[PDB]
Amino acid sequence: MSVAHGLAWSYYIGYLRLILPELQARIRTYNQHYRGAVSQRLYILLPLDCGVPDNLDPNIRFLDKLPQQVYSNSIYELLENGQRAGTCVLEYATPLQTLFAMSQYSQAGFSREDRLEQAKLFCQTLEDILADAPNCRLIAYQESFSLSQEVLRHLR
Amino acid sequence: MSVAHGLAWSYYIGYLRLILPELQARIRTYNQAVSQRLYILLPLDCGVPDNLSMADPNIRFLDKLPQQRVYSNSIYELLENGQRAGTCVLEYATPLQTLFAMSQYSQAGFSREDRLEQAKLFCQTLEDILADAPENCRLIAYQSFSLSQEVLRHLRQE
Ligand SMILES: CCn1nc(C)cc1C(=O)/N=c1\n(C)c2cc(C(N)=O)ccc2n1C/C(C)=C(\C)Cn1/c(=N/C(=O)c2cc(C)nn2CC)n(C)c2cc(C(N)=O)cc(OCc3cccc(OC)c3)c21
């Protein structure tokens, strides 16, 4: 019954439930067609400070788009000690942009303290929705800091 | 900090604030009449059908609103006494689909009574965001029934 609950349900109903059923087959088509294979599962970055940059760290490099289906998903390499240590489909949780905007607009009556509480609640709520819906993994973190090491810990 | 508050802000930040600044130029290009506002249908029961061009016999698809993301918007004629009584850009408020889904799934802990309360609060919150937003968008909230008469009542106020 919070801001976070509506955002988690909208993100699941309006996006994840529509793209997750076909993701495994798209990754497989990419790996079969074309060092190291693209890991299965969609990795969602959840910066709890709600700082979502315009273009997804020196050790996270874009490689290619995945074959569509009107969904654009990107494959990245993760570097460790300067070399490729993993490859995966990665993307930011867009509802955290709305939490950031609500903290910025006075009309929302939503403080930066409310924002962090709702970001944590969004992560927990989304985790619980996905646990009850049998190809996805949430990477929550609060930002020196290495995002590549954060993703690599989940991949391994 | 209610469910409605987050849905109204996501719908504004992630859709309306991006589409509304170019709406007047798109309507002007088609007219050069179609009303100057985006009319958003808000069925408070949260029943959003798959196709608006088949929702009412007196709401007929006229044309796609041209370009001046690439947004797809539709222009409809509203009939009264079998004749064109108004023309406007019309579409359903998609966040009401999430309110419907939350009432359907036990995990959400969200009753049909909560759904209607949040649907009304979503309408109020969105109207207040749009009233103060930068200087073209009207909300049509409603619960035999004529949807064309509902839209025409709003159009005739403008
Ligand atoms: C919606 C689920 N969701 N809930 C929360 C919380 C956050 C998210 C979320 O972030 N959603 C998405 N992600 C991460 C996505 C990633 C990918 C990918 N991998 O490529 C692809 C799609 C993705 N979507 C779906 C989006 C962005 C829409 C459907 C936007 N949209 C929209 N929105 C609303 O209903 C809504 C309700 C609430 C509440 N808040 N909103 C605003 C978001 N309406 C009416 C739209 C109408 C039109 C029109 N008139 O034709 C067009 C739209 O968008 C054309 C478009 C085209 C291409 C790229 C593009 O942007 C990528 C957008 C409309």
Residue numbers in the entry:
A (entry chain A): 153 to 186, 191 to 212, 216 to 228, 239 to 303, 308 to 316, 322 to 334
B (entry chain B): 153 to 184, 193 to 228, 238 to 304, 308 to 315, 322 to 336
The authors write:
To elucidate the differences in molecular architecture between orthosteric STING inhibition and activation, we determined the crystal structures of human STING155-341 bound to the orthosteric inhibitor, diABZI-i, and the orthosteric activator, diABZI-a1, derived from the diABZI series. However, the differences between the two structures are unexpectedly modest with a r.m.s.d. of 0.548 Å2 for all atoms. Moreover, both compounds adopt similar positioning within the binding pocket with no obvious mechanistic rationale for their reciprocal functions evident in the crystal structures. Comparisons between STING bound to diABZI-i and diABZI-a1 do not reveal any significant differences in lid formation to explain inhibition or activation. Both compounds elicit a disordered STING lid organization that does not extend over the binding pocket, which has been previously described in both apo STING and STING bound to cyclic-di-GMP (cdG), a bacteria-derived STING agonist. Another well-reported feature of cGAMP-STING binding is the shortening of the apical wing distance between STING monomers. Both diABZI bound structures adopt a splayed open conformation with an apical wing distance of ~47 Å and ~52 Å for diAZBI-a1 and diABZI-i, respectively. Therefore, the totality of our analysis indicates that STING155-341 crystallography cannot readily distinguish between diABZI-driven STING inhibition and activation. Most notably, the methyl group on the M271 side chain (M271CH3) exhibited a significant downfield shift in both proton (0.920 ppm) and carbon (1.217 ppm) dimensions with diABZI-a1 but not diABZI-i. In contrast, diABZI-i demonstrates expected inhibition in the WT THP-1 cGAMP stimulation model (IC50 = 3 ± 2 μM) but potent agonism in the V155M SAVI model (EC50 = 17 ± 7 nM) with a > 170x increase in potency relative to inhibition potency in WT THP-1s.
